Amino acid sequence: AGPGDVVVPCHGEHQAGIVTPPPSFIALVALDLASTSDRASVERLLRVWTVDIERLTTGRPGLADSEPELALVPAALTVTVGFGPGLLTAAGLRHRAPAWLHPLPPFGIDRLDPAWCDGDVVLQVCADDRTTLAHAVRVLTKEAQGLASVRWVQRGFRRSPGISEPDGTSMRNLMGQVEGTANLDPRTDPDLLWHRDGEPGWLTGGTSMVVRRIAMNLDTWDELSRGAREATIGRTLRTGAPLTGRAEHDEPDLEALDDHGRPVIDLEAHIRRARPTQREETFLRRAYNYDEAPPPGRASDSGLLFVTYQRDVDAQFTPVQRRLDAADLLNEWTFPVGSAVFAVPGGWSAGEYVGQRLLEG
Amino acid sequence: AGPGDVVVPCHGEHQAGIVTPPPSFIALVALDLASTSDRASVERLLRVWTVDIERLTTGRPGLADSEPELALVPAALTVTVGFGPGLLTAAGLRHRAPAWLHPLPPFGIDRLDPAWCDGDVVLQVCADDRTTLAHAVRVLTKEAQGLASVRWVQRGFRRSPGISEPDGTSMRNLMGQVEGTANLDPRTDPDLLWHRDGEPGWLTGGTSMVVRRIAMNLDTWDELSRGAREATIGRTLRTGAPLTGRAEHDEPDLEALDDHGRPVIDLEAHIRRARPTQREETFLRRAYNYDEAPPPGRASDSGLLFVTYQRDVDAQFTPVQRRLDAADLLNEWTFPVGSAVFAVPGGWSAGEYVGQRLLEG
Numbered sequence: 001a002g003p004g005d006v007v008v009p010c011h012g013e014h015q016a017g018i019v020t021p022p023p024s025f026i027a028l029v030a031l032d033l034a035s036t037s038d039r040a041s042v043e044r045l046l047r048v049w050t051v052d053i054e055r056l057t058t059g060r061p062g063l064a065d066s067e068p069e070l071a072l073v074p075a076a077l078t079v080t081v082g083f084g085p086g087l088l089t090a091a092g093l094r095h096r097a098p099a100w101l102h103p104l105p106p107f108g109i110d111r112l113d114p115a116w117c118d119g120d121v122v123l124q125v126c127a128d129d130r131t132t133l134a135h136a137v138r139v140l141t142k143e144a145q146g147l148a149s150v151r152w153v154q155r156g157f158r159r160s161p162g163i164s165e166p167d168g169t170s171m172r173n174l175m176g177q178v179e180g181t182a183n184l185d186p187r188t189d190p191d192l193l194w195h196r197d198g199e200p201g202w203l204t205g206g207t208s209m210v211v212r213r214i215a216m217n218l219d220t221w222d223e224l225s226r227g228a229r230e231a232t233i234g235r236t237l238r239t240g241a242p243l244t245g246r247a248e249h250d251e252p253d254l255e256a257l258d259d260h261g262r263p264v265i266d267l268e269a270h271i272r273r274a275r276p277t278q279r280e281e282t283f284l285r286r287a288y289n290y291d292e293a294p295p296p297g298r299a300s301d302s303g304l305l306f307v308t309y310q311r312d313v314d315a316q317f318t319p320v321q322r323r324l325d326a327a328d329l330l331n332e333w334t335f336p337v338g339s340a341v342f343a344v345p346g347g348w349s350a351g352e353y354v355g356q357r358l359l360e361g
Numbered sequence: 362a363g364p365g366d367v368v369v370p371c372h373g374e375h376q377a378g379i380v381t382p383p384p385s386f387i388a389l390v391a392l393d394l395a396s397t398s399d400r401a402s403v404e405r406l407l408r409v410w411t412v413d414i415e416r417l418t419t420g421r422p423g424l425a426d427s428e429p430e431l432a433l434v435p436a437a438l439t440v441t442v443g444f445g446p447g448l449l450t451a452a453g454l455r456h457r458a459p460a461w462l463h464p465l466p467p468f469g470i471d472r473l474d475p476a477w478c479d480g481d482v483v484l485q486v487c488a489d490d491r492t493t494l495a496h497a498v499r500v501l502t503k504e505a506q507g508l509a510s511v512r513w514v515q516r517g518f519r520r521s522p523g524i525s526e527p528d529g530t531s532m533r534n535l536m537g538q539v540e541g542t543a544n545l546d547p548r549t550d551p552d553l554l555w556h557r558d559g560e561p562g563w564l565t566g567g568t569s570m571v572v573r574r575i576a577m578n579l580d581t582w583d584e585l586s587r588g589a590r591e592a593t594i595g596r597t598l599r600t601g602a603p604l605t606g607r608a609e610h611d612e613p614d615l616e617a618l619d620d621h622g623r624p625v626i627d628l629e630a631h632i633r634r635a636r637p638t639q640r641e642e643t644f645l646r647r648a649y650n651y652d653e654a655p656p657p658g659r660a661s662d663s664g665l666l667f668v669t670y671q672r673d674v675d676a677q678f679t680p681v682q683r684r685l686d687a688a689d690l691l692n693e694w695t696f697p698v699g700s701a702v703f704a705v706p707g708g709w710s711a712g713e714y715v716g717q718r719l720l721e722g
């Protein structure tokens with residue numbers, strides 16, 4: 001009857017937690033395989049995780065679960081499994097690596113901290129309840145004991161269940177902006193998200209995942225007028241409308257000039273520079289806010305858990321990231337501190353296990 | 362109407378966020394005053410914070426608030442202000458310090474990390490939404506820039522709004538236990554929470570606040586059977602009933618023996634050792650779960666944000682803490698890593714400011 005009772009099916013053509021409507025909370029858990037790891041280790045790990053995913057997501061305790069009462073409220077729990085290149089190396093499956101399974105190239109804007117970078121495998125754990133999420137993470141982490149150890153955990157949030165943004169907007173970030181308006185529609189453009197026919201065959205129903213941890217300099221952001229902040233993005237903070245429109249969902253008019261013949265939306269405005277240049281230069285953004293205990297001598301450690309899904313990182317994401325590196329006003333108040341690329345297996349049915357089509361050989 | 366629309370009044374005989382039903386999220390922000398601080402600094406700080414509290418809690422932007430749209434959803438926001446000894450020192454008011462305003466005495470069980478200890482002032486910021494909380498914390502922190510800097514921030518959680526525990530229980534902690542059953546009732550025993558007539562006069566309507574950051578060794582806790590975990594506390598994990606009863610709210614029978622003449626609830630069981638020995642040896646527990654990104658070698662960094670409120674720390678809390686130090690089975694799987702004591706001013710009305718009765722002189 002309430003948001004705690006919601007079960008999201010973990011079985012299908014695709015893994016859940018990608019086109020699944022984003023719930024309130026996320027923990028991205030990157031793990032590194034043990035030095036002893038081989039194909040058999042990786043297989044066992046994926047198989048024990050499959051059991052725990054099928055149980056936890058239906059509000060049943062996991063296999064390595066000593067706190068069953070912490071499992072009984074599923075709260076729309078999803079776990080999405082992604083493989084880093086090191087997993088394929090350790091399994092002896094380099095020959096099955098897609099061309100795009102590698103770190104993003106370096107960019108001038110990068111301030112990458114290796115402790116927020118890479119990972120042999122990732123669990124994107126999402127739920128509408130923080131206790132449910134804490135439990136799921138504890139169970140999945142324990143299950144991997146001796147097979148993989150935690151490399152990093154990035155925690156993020158949106159509004160709570162039953163709490164919609166001011167004026168029913170998509171998501172508010174900690175810069176105070178509306179985020180998610182002009183996203184990839186996987187109902188119209190499924191071929192730009194989902195791997196179908198191509199090589200390698202094990203990625204059928206699967207995708208690629210990018211995680212950029214992008215810090216917001218809120219201290220310098222505070223030095224900008226409202227007008228300068230809106231010019232930076234090309235959309236208003238109140239409604240989330242383009243500078244040229246009245247409502248959130250109005251099409252930005254990138255041809256529109258002011259009385260002096262200057263573009264209304266700046267030549268270096270985020271949404272101009274980030275816009276698709278070709279059909280394929282788009283991706284499913286599925287971002288979350290992060291807000292940490294601040295470091296010595298600062299008020300805040302806030303930013304964006306920028307998670308994107310696309311068929312091919314190199315063809316779809318990287319050309320956009322490369323265009324923003326070259327020019328984007330937003331780069332003056334944001335900086336990437338973490339980068340990770342993962343291959344996401346397709347879904348599975350009762351009796352299968354996640355990544356099975358890969359570990360066949 | 363939804364949980365986002367809820368306004369908790371910040372005006373009354375007492376500060377809100379103490380007897381206010383606990384909402385989903387908490388951030389305790391400890392700040393340290395600058396060395397150059399004086400009575401005028403402290404007064405200004407409390408006055409600018411009073412404005413921000415009155416605004417943010419009613420879903421209006423703060424004074425130093427450049428992200429107003431992040432303020433529009435109050436989500437039951439409360440801010441509770443506590444003063445550490447250093448605030449009274451800095452204001453030239455040591456002579457107004459109650460006898461109990463000092464760090465707790467040291468205990469054998471203490472593993473206190475100075476970075477989680479003390480603070481000249483604390484903001485307990487509570488809300489049913491994490492974006493609302495992140496915003497409030499950002500506004501209050503910015504407002505103190507040049508008067509006080511952040512010392513630590515402890516973040517915690519319960520279940521999300523509209524999400525109740527399995528079988529309508531009080532709160533589940535990350536040991537999987539029911540927490541909050543045998544708490545101080547301030548409706549029956551208000552004199553054990555609230556300072557009324559006594560010296561010092563400025564604490565009328567006020568209280569004392571203890572924050573213990575208590576780490577859970579979940580790795581060693583996992584080595585215990587269900588029976589051993591229940592024996593440790595003296596209550597069952599499923600229902601939260603005493604070992605001697607059937608339901609959560611049954612009175613524990615501490616005289617009850619098994620067929621072998623052993624006490625049914627262990628002599629060193631948490632709820633036996635923690636029970637009041639005298640009427641005054643009780644306090645309002647208002648605890649939250651903490652779950653951090655784990656340190657390099659470990660699966661989890663989980664524990665309890667143990668926040669308590671009482672008229673007098675020395676008379677009420679410390680004798681209980683001292684009895685648990687002497688013997689408690691739970692001490693084998695928990696350890697305190699942070700300790701802070703604060704004096705909590707009484708409430709205020711439209712046109713007053715928090716702590717005004719102190720800064721009079």
Ligand code: HEM
Nearest residue numbers: 177178179180181182214233271274275276304320321334
């Ligand atoms: C802190 C970092 C960032 C912030 C605060 C941010 C914020 C925003 C905002 C406010 C919008 C407009 C609303 C929307 O359509 O979602 C937007 C759009 C977009 N952003 Fe970002 N963004 C950030 C980083 C990135 C990065 C690194 C990329 C890299 C590819 C990216 C790609 C996009 C794209 C493609 C759009 C849609 C543009 C359109 O077609 O109108 N963003 N972002």
Ligand code: HEM
Nearest residue numbers: 538539540541542543575594632635636637665681682695
């Ligand atoms: C991680 C640390 C701790 C855990 C997991 C924990 C857990 C619990 C649990 C499960 C209960 C039984 C349910 C209830 O009545 O609340 C309880 C009761 C209690 N705890 Fe703790 N506790 C911890 C630390 C402390 C500390 C440091 C104190 C310090 C004074 C304390 C004081 C109490 C009191 C007074 C009760 C009620 C006892 C009664 O009258 O039946 N606890 N705690």
